[PDB]
Amino acid sequence: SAQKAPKWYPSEDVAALKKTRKAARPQKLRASLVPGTVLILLAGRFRGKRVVYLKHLEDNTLLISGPFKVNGVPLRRVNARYVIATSTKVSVEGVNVEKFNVEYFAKEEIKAERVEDQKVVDKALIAEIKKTPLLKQYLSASFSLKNGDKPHMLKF
Amino acid sequence: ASLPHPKIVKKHTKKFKRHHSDRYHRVAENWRKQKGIDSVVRRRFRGNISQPKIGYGSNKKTKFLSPSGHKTFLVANVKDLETLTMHTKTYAAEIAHNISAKNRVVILARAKALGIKVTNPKGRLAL
Amino acid sequence: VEPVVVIDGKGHLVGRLASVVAKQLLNGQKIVVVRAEELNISGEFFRNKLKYHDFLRKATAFNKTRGPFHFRAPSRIFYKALRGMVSHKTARGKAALERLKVFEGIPPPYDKKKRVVVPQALRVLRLKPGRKYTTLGKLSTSVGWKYEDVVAKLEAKRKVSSAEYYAKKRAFTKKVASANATAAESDVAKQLAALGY
Amino acid sequence: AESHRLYVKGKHLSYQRSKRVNNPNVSLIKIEGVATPQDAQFYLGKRIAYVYRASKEVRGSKIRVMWGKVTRTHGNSGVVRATFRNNLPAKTFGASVRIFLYPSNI
Amino acid sequence: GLRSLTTVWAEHLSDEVKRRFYKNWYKSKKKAFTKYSAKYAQDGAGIER
RNA sequence: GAAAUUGUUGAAAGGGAAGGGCAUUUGAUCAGACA
RNA sequence: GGAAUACUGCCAGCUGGGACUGAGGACUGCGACGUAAGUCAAGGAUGCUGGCAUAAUGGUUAUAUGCCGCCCGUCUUGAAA
RNA sequence: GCCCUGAAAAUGGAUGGCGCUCAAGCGUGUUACCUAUACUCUACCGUCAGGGUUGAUAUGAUGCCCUGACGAGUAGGCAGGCGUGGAGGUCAGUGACGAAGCCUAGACCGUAAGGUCGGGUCGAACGGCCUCUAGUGCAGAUCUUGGUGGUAGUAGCAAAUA
RNA sequence: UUGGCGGAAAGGCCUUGGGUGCUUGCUGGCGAAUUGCAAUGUCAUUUUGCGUGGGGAUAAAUCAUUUGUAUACGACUUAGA
Ligand SMILES: [Cl-]
Ligand SMILES: [Cl-]
Ligand SMILES: [Cl-]
Ligand SMILES: [Mg+2]
Ligand SMILES: [Mg+2]
Ligand SMILES: [Mg+2]
Ligand SMILES: [Mg+2]
Ligand SMILES: [Mg+2]
Ligand SMILES: [Mg+2]
Ligand SMILES: [Mg+2]
Ligand SMILES: [Mg+2]
Ligand SMILES: [Mg+2]
Ligand SMILES: [Mg+2]
Ligand SMILES: [Mg+2]
Ligand SMILES: [Mg+2]
Ligand SMILES: [Mg+2]
Ligand SMILES: [Mg+2]
Ligand SMILES: [Mg+2]
Ligand SMILES: [Mg+2]
Ligand SMILES: [Mg+2]
Ligand SMILES: [Mg+2]
Ligand SMILES: [Mg+2]
Ligand SMILES: [Mg+2]
């Protein structure tokens, strides 16, 4: 024999885990995040864009709209830790967002229903934006840091 | 394809080389404890090589485990291989260095039938 | 914040300026020092002249070309003080010293650029009035610097050209200010004032 | 516009060290515009990326990144301590780093 | 220190000076100052400037 | 048919020695799981 | 004559940001919240999601950079000598 | 009190260096900050101590498991292990379809002594485990024998007429 | 493209004229999605090499020989179509 067989062989069965005392409780957002607030994206394909926050989803994500007709940002999800909440707020009453949920953004060219629902949501938002001067132009521009800007001193 | 285990941690991956084994050819790298009265290695002065000690011992739950999670067992023939028939999730067979080319074919065929992992299946392969 | 910072050495204490510049170089900032002949050193002229003589008598006994090298130019005197505050024998120290340039006067590459000052090293803000101080240009001449008159003549020519530029710029600034003054009291001007601008 | 920057410029100063011993696991970072520990509290937890170039391309790019995070403040002059997944190389003493605005508490 | 700004040479040079510019005078084609002499071929604008 | 020592070829570094410890960059090279 | 505030101390008062750690592996204990069923932050981490599945992580090796590192053995109160 | 005179040594020179003058000096007071193999908490290794568990049908009661504390070391003591030549037993062990040896900035295991595998070279014997035995482990002793360097294509190869 | 100025390392600065693109000074109309909830998400300047074509220019040094104003050897200084 090349090697003597072990006298004792360990067990081959897998023990079950102990009961875990970790109950999931709903996330609470920071006070600055209110529906209708203008948000500044900090990362991703649309980094620097200014979008409108609409609804909080079940998966701790935020539903946002550009609107797509203004800056080209469609209805998407963003992480709450990757946005900056400004003080500018747009009225959100009159916008139907109950249809959008986690399964609506399921992964599984462009889907026909997504385009149609984009125009329905944007129609109400754009009407509200027109009542504030320079608001449409503000959402079209992109945010950036200039020389001498101190983020710890800037007020949004 | 082995039993679940905690992450394997190595406290000291670097080899312990004998002092001044890189200075003279007559001094091998096999570890030897310096016992000189004035030796800076024995006295543990800052900036010198580290010495092996029991504090580096690995966790007993992952000791002797290969990165795949199996323990190595040396096998010379089919009968030795069949010892691991009911221990396929903890032991892997390794063919001895002095096994002929024709006898390795029989062992590899038997090991695949029993589901026993082989760590060196390409040895003496006439491909 | 500038990619290159140009420091006017006039009225600066050599030691306090050297410590500031050395830290800037090690942090990755390029520094250019001009008018090194106008640097100041605390203490009367005789004391600093005596100190340089003590430096002059130090040399390798068996070969004078091996010992310490005594540079007489004002720019190199400031360089010596600066190199003593940097670990110049390391690769990191060598890289830092390559970010520094010292000149007597203001050479043509920098005479049309902006020059700044270092308040921490300013003689007028640091020394108590009545204390004696020495000008680096005069000290260098007494120890064997040959180009004091040449730099003085070139500096006089540069100042004449700079004065003409300022007179032209000042006239243009007056016209621009008047345009802004008459553009005030408008609707746009009032809105800017409400927002701080 | 002419500018697209979404980060704060920073400099890699050195490792955490005593007079004669250094600790490469911790790096000291200087953030532009911060000159007080109270101001430096804003940047705690922010992600840090070091961006450098290489001649060889591997995953469709010749640019490589080393990621880190601000952990705590350092001294009285706005310097902060940072830790990276792999320690920053010593040749980067005096090089530029990027301090991002995420994760965001605003 | 003093620095030389420009040097202006005469139109014609004898073989005595041209030998100073060669190490193998007997093998050379004696092309020295041939293109410089063309500066005088004009009215003299290059030399006068 | 080992070492000291040597030739050729290949790779790399070198401003008054070389060699070493901790950490990472770069180059080269390589194992493990695709359940 | 009537208060306020500073200073010192206490609260089994409330609350925001950052870092490091996740050891254990059926149940058993002590409590909390509830009429009850039960639930819980109560004798040690779980849930959701994305990219990649290969030299990407990692190992080895050469080199570079920051800091540190004097030649071993021996006698000796004391050795780089 | 501070400063100055008193105050002279041999290579060039040292508050550690640069340099510093309402100091970056001297006396004193108040806070912030930096960092040891020390202190606090957690993980892992080992040691010691106090305990639990024989019940068959699944293998080690020298087993497995729970709890707490501890860890510097020359001369020196003790303990547990690694490696070598030979011997009894066993694996009806490996091998000319390639044993042993040697080379290999290739891979794996062990805190370590070491063990294992792949590739190249090679040609006839050799190994694991339980025990027995010793002419059993080298860096030094102006150590023994043999081999080989730098010095170095260097010193030199110039008396006696050609 | 007109002219002037700048030699401390000038290699830059200012100015004339017209051509052309853009203009967010103001008002409009279309486009963006799918990089799927972040991943530098690649936009800079260093050097050199190999193929294109539009111009420009057609040499020297060394060895060997020779000289002695030189010389241990190298070096130096002279000559030779
Ligand atoms: Cl180094
Ligand atoms: Cl071992
Ligand atoms: Cl000669
Ligand atoms: Mg001793
Ligand atoms: Mg002189
Ligand atoms: Mg032979
Ligand atoms: Mg050899
Ligand atoms: Mg790696
Ligand atoms: Mg040292
Ligand atoms: Mg004695
Ligand atoms: Mg000794
Ligand atoms: Mg004091
Ligand atoms: Mg001990
Ligand atoms: Mg063999
Ligand atoms: Mg080798
Ligand atoms: Mg034979
Ligand atoms: Mg013996
Ligand atoms: Mg020996
Ligand atoms: Mg010995
Ligand atoms: Mg000997
Ligand atoms: Mg000879
Ligand atoms: Mg002789
Ligand atoms: Mg003779």
C116 membership: H or E segment, kind and range: none
CATH of the domain at D76: 2.40.10.190
Residue C3 contacts D, CB cutoff 8 Å: no
Q: Is the CB of C172 under 7 A from strand I?
A: no
Backbone dihedral region of C57: left (phi > 0), alpha (psi from -120 to 50 degrees) or beta?
Answer: alpha
Query: How far is Cα A36 from Cα A95, in angstroms, rounded to an integer?
Result: 10
Q: Is C162 helix (H, G, I), strand (E, B) or coil?
A: helix
Chain D window 7-26: which residues touch C at a Cβ cutoff of 8 Å? 11, 13
**At what resolution in Å was this solved?**
2.2
Query: How far is Cα C106 from Cα B102, in angstroms, rounded to an integer?
Result: 87
D-chain CB neighbours of A42 within 8 Å are 6, 100-102, 104
Domains by residue range for chain C, with CATH: 1-147 (3.90.1180.10), 148-197 (1.20.5.4280)
Obtained via which technique?
A: cryo-EM
Domain that holds residue D64: 1-106
Query: How far is Cα A71 from Cα A47, in angstroms, rounded to an integer?
Result: 12
C-chain CB neighbours of D95 within 8 Å are 28
CB A59 within 8 A of CB A102: yes
Residue D89 contacts C, CB cutoff 8 Å: no
Is the peptide bond prior to C109 cis by the omega test (within 30 degrees of 0)? no
Residue C94 contacts D, CB cutoff 8 Å: no
Q: Which is nearest to B76 in space by CA: B51, B96, B60?
A: B96
Structure-block tokens of residue B52: 């092996």
Checking each nucleotide's C1' against the CA of D86, the nearest proves to be: F24
Name the closest residue (CA) to the C1' of nucleotide F19: B23
Q: Do A83 and D100 touch (CB under 8 A)?
A: no
Nearby residues of B91 by Cβ (< 8 Å), 6 or more positions away: B70, B71, B72, B73, B84
Closest by Cβ to A2, choosing from B75, B89, B90: B75
Q: Do A151 and D8 touch (CB under 8 A)?
A: yes
Query: How far is Cα E11 from Cα E40, in angstroms, rounded to an integer?
Result: 7
Q: Which residue in this structure is represented by tokens 């007997």?
A: E26
Is the peptide bond prior to D103 cis by the omega test (within 30 degrees of 0)? yes
Nearby residues of C66 by Cβ (< 8 Å), 6 or more positions away: C60
Structure-block tokens of residue C107: 């050479």
Query: How far is Cα C5 from Cα B94, in angstroms, rounded to an integer?
Result: 68
DSSP D64: E
Structure-block tokens of residue E37: 């002499």
Q: Do D100 and A144 touch (CB under 8 A)?
A: no
Residue B70 CA and nucleotide F30 C1' are separated, in Å, by: 20
CB E13 within 8 A of CB E33: yes
A38 membership: H or E segment, kind and range: strand A37-41
Q: Which residue in this structure is represented by tokens 């990619």?
A: C3
Name the closest residue (CA) to the C1' of nucleotide I80: E26
Structure-block tokens of residue E38: 């063309």
Q: Do C28 and D30 touch (CB under 8 A)?
A: no
D16 membership: H or E segment, kind and range: strand D7-17
Domain count, chain D: 1
